[PDB]
């Protein structure tokens, strides 16, 4: 498996345009778990290889090829078919950080 | 002129896959205005023609009369994405403060946030 918020998957994000984050990489699920259970789509934030940016969350400890960063300014809705290997899932504390970054990114406060 | 949260732009979402919303269509800007000013990208939510009355927590309806829209429409806060600004075409309108509050609420729900 069931897809859950906080899970990290591999996903082919290509193709992309301009300054969009592309290439088959890791992403973290940020959609609520009702949508994750039933809907054909999920919402994710891009993760990339590694400053102090309010919309960025660092992740060391997570089965990752390198020290990475979650980009909360880089988010999108993907068909579940795009999801490949499940890698890990983030701690409750790290998800609190993601939640904070996401609020700032989307001007939610 | 500047791109502002709550603005509605016509935008090119193609190409996409499966149930991802594609096509050239209205989107609403949901990124904060610091990003909208300085960043090469914006984050938006897709808007589609209202195909049926339905009470969906992640959906927010828009009045065709109230705004400059071809049809009665609905904002899909489960269909969002980060777009290079070059994908934005014409600025169509912008949403009221009250309508934007509904959007923020639908967005909190969609993204499993609560406050």
**DSSP strand count of chain A:** 6
Q: Helicity range of the residues of chain A?
A: 10-25%
- Give the strand order, joined by hyphens, for the main sheet of chain A: 4-5-3-2-1-6
CATH architecture of chain A: Roll
Distance between the termini of chain A: 33 Å
Strand content of chain A: 35-45%
N-to-C SSE series of chain A?
EEHEEEEH
Summed up, the domain count of chain A is 1
CATH domain class name of chain A: Mainly Beta
Task: Give the oligomeric state.
Answer: homodimer
Q: Which fold name corresponds to the CATH topology of chain A? A: SH3 type barrels
Q: Report the sheet with the most strands of chain A, covering strand number, pairing sense and barrel closure.
A: 6 strands, antiparallel
Tell me which protein chains meet in the greatest interface and how many residues each side has.
A-B, 36 and 37 residues
Q: Give the overall shape of chain A.
A: globular
Number of helices of chain A: 2
Task: Please state the CA-atom Rg of chain A, rounded to the nearest Å.
Answer: 13 Å
SSE-based structural type of chain A: alpha+beta
Would you summarize the structure shown here?
Two copies of one chain form a homodimer. By secondary structure, chain A is an alpha+beta fold. Chain A is 18% helix and 39% strand.
Give an overview of the whole structure.
Two copies of one chain form a homodimer. Chain A is an alpha+beta fold and 109 residues long. In chain A, 18% of the residues lie in helices and 39% in strands. Chain A has one domain: Roll (SH3 type barrels), CATH 2.30.30. Chain A is built from two helices and six strands; from the N terminus they run ββαββββα. In chain A, strand 4 and strand 5 (68-79) form a beta hairpin. The longest helix of chain A is centred in the C-terminal third of the chain and has 14 residues, at 92-105. The PDB classes it as hydrolase. The entry lists the keywords CcdB/MazF fold, ribonuclease, MazE, mRNA interferase, hydrolase. The assembly is dimeric. MazF from S. aureus crystal form I, P212121, 2.1 A.
